[PDB]
Amino acid sequence: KSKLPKPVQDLIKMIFDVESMKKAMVEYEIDLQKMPLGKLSKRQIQAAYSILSEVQQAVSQGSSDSQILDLSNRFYTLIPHDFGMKKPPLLNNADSVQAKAEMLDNLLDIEVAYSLLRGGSDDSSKDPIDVNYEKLKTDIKVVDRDSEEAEIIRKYVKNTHATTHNAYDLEVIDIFKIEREGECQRYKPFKQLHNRRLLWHGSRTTNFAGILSQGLRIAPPEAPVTGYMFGKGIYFADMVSKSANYCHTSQGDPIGLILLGEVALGNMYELKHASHISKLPKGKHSVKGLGKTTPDPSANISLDGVDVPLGTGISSGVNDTSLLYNEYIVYDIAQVNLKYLLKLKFNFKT
């Protein structure tokens, strides 16, 4: 019978929920019959990634228009879809592969979750909830609702909700202090690096077994580049709202998980438009996508040598940028130390 607190157990249940994995594969219009979660293999997901890479290649660099067809065919063969009577869309443009790349990105973390979940031995003195918690290799302490942390974190949530993301409201349900096994040592060199900021990373609940057990990761070479305004990196926002939208919560499932991450931003390569450099200029350690609105500098609180940008949104200088709001990207997974995981309730508009 579990030691773990009520909120933590609920979290463990939530991220190891086989049904949410299933639901999300359905949303992506995968064929569950030809492919169950058990069959979901790491090998094909990486193989299917390579096929995605063979497309995008060709297309505007080659393009046989019948080899493209065989490729699209090798894809849905590998990852069986179920459009029913409609046939799958041929993978013949960038926008087309972005969508299927993003999906593999999720199946990857889903495979991680289910692998984790159905792995291990049942010594069974401790109930599965204890077991599954230990599979995450992360310490998770509940942050007291009435503390100073909790109030700053809630202020960060309240103040940085964007003017144009008003399709819902955010209520913090639980706040977790998190410590990934080994991440301190990993982050250790970047701790001396200046300009360190507590920033938002939103993702779907089905990625958290993966995110907690392995950290925020970077897309490998086998993957495309489309949609990536600043390359293959780990992205963050200073507005809870920019990040929440990537939880992919609906009126039907209104509860989301978001991360607070300390990120060692160093000298930021400040940008206004999508240049895929990926290789920074020397003495630059991150990219900051400049936006029209920014959190308010006069309120950037500092704790334990780390900037919390809980200024409410005001006019940034920036003129002639495509960016909604700011956006921070690093290209080395070690520049990130996860600090908090928040259970968010999305209270949907009207």
Ligand SMILES: C[C@H](NC(=O)CN1CCc2cccc3c2[C@@H]1CNC3=O)C(=O)N1CC=C(c2ccc(F)cc2)CC1
């Ligand atoms: C590029 C991709 N980004 C996204 O899916 C969405 N994000 C980009 C835009 C953005 C901007 C500001 C804040 C956020 C984002 C989001 C992620 N959530 C953030 O709050 C990404 O960084 N991933 C991390 C790990 C990827 C990966 C894929 C394959 C693999 F083998 C290893 C890692 C999958 C997705």
